[PDB]
Amino acid sequence: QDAASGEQVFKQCLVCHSIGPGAKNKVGPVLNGLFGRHSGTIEGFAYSDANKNSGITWTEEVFREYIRDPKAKIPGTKMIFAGVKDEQKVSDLIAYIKQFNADGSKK
Numbered sequence: 001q002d003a004a005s006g007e008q009v010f011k012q013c014l015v016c017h018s019i020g021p022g023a024k025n026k027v028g029p030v031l032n033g034l035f036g037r038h039s040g041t042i043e044g045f046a047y048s049d050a051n052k053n054s055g056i057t058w059t060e061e062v063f064r065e066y067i068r069d070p071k072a073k074i075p076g077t078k079m080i081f082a083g084v085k086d087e088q089k090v091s092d093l094i095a096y097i098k099q100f101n102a103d104g105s106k107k
C-alpha cells in the first residue's frame with residue numbers, strides 16, 4: 001500500500017525505534033531491513049528472552065499478526081505497546097518499513 005501514509009503511522013514507533021540512515025538502537029532495536037530477519041538478532045540490543053528465543057522470522061504475515069497485539073504473539077515482551085488494529089494502517093506501515101535496506105538506504 002501507501003509508503004507515504006505508512007510514514008505517518010510509523011510516528012508512534014519512532015519514539016522507541018529508529019529507521020533510515022544513521023539509525024541507532026534506542027528503547028527499541030533499529031528496524032532497517034526488518035523483513036526476512038530472525039527475531040532478536042539486531043546487534044547491540046538487549047532483547048528479552050521472550051523476544052530472543054521466540055523462533056520467529058519476520059515475514060509480512062507474521063508481522064501483521066504481531067503488530068495487532070504484540071503481547072499476544074510474544075508474551076512477556078518488553079515492547080509494552082498496544083498495537084495497531086487498523087487493517088489499512090498496517091498495510092501502509094509495512095509499505096513504509098519495506099523501503100529500507102539493512103543499512104538504512106532506500107531500495
Ligand code: HEC
Binds near residue numbers: 010015038041047078
Ligand atoms: C517503545 C514504547 C515502543 C514502541 C511505541 C514500539 N516499539 Fe517495537 N520494540 C520496543 C522494544 C523494547 C522492543 C524489544 C522488545 C523485547 O522484548 O526485547 C521492540 C521490538 C519490536 C520488534 C521485534 C524486533 C526484533 O525481533 O528484532 C518489532 C518488529 C517492533 N518492535 C516493531 C514496532 C513497530 C512497527 C512499532 C510501531 C507500530 C513499534 N515497534 C512500536 C519498543 C517499542
